[PDB]
Write a structure and sequence with these properties.
Distance between the termini: 45 Å
Structural class: alpha/beta
Radius of gyration: 15 Å
Strand content: 15-25%
Helix content: 10-25%
Strand order of the largest sheet: 1-4-5
Length: 125
RNA sequence: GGUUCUAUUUUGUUGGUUUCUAGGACCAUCGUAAUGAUUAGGGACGGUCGGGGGCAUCGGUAUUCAAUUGUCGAGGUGAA
């Protein structure tokens, strides 16, 4: 209904999850599809870029009803849902958008990056 | 007994002239003969650099908490 011709998307990609939403050019959503929303949860068997491509592709089905052309992605973290490889999966979503009738606008890396990169130890909550 | 005059020396005091001696303030230059390529200390004037200091403000990103919308499972690990 909205017919917002471009919009942003943050690709969240933690170790188990790879949902892909695609919002408009202002902020409010219209469509997000979860990894569990693509039927699977089995914790260890959630990692790879291969099953993560399917969850990110079912986004395009309901995104059709609005009609977003250029999806401008912001990748946060790297992981996804698995059928094969343990480890990365955030590269999956970019392939899903590119294979559908949706277009890529720009690729941005939007991560909380510290200066020195360790795991934290030393101080409160 | 001593007085008086004259000459000389010494001590104190005063004045003109001649000659000689102490003491106080401030500043220039570094010459050459006795260890041999020496501007050794403090700055004033005029430009200049820096995350040196303390305080008072201000801005941005990320995280967390609280409230509200759209949307249904996640987080961890070598497996758990």
């Amino acid at each position: 209904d909205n017919s917002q011709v471009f919009g942003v998307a943050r690709i969240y990609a933690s170790f188990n999850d790879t949902f892909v939403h695609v919002t408009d050019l202002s902020g409010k959503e219209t469509i997000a599809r979860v990894t569990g929303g693509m039927k699977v949860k089995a914790d260890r068997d959630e990692s790879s870029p291969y099953a993560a491509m399917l969850a990110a592709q079912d986004v395009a089905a309901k995104c059709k009803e609005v009609g977003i052309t250029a999806v401008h992605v912001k990748i946060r973290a790297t992981g996804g849902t698995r059928t094969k490889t343990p480890g990365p999966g955030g590269q999956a979503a970019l392939r899903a958008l590119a294979r559908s009738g949706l277009r890529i606008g720009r690729i941005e890396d939007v991560t909380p990056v510290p200066s020195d990169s360790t795991r934290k130890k030393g101080g409160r909550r």
